[PDB]
Amino acid sequence: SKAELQSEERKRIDELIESGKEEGMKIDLIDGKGRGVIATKQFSRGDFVVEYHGDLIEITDAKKREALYAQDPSTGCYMYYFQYLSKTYCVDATRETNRLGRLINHSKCGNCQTKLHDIDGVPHLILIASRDIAAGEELLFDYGDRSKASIEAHPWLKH
């Protein structure tokens, strides 16, 4: 039944969010990208891959932080914006951690899709396999920034 399956699916995902378990992945160096994350096991279409884990903040704090980050070229670009219940939030993963979602590179034709996953009105950004993923693949998803200012500075956004 759609009901029992929706329940089972929620329990798998929530279990994984909470454990912060990030099995099946490793960091590699990728020519022209810096670090990236390689799958070490197969993932099936629809599987939880990893959370995009960082600091969950609202719009005012996000703006404050960007202004600060821009004053430093070495910072890098780890803020992930979304809409939730008519408000803008951001998962800011700028701080170096051992979490892997923040190291995944961009492709418009990647193998992960980001989903908003509500746990009791607290939003989480999760990456789900958009297709079966072979061990050895680079994990990739669409960063989603299509703006002229960004694609000019960072031309790999076009691909």
Add this chain to the structure above:
Amino acid sequence: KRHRKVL
């Protein structure tokens, strides 16, 4: 010049 990520 920075880029972002957007859902």
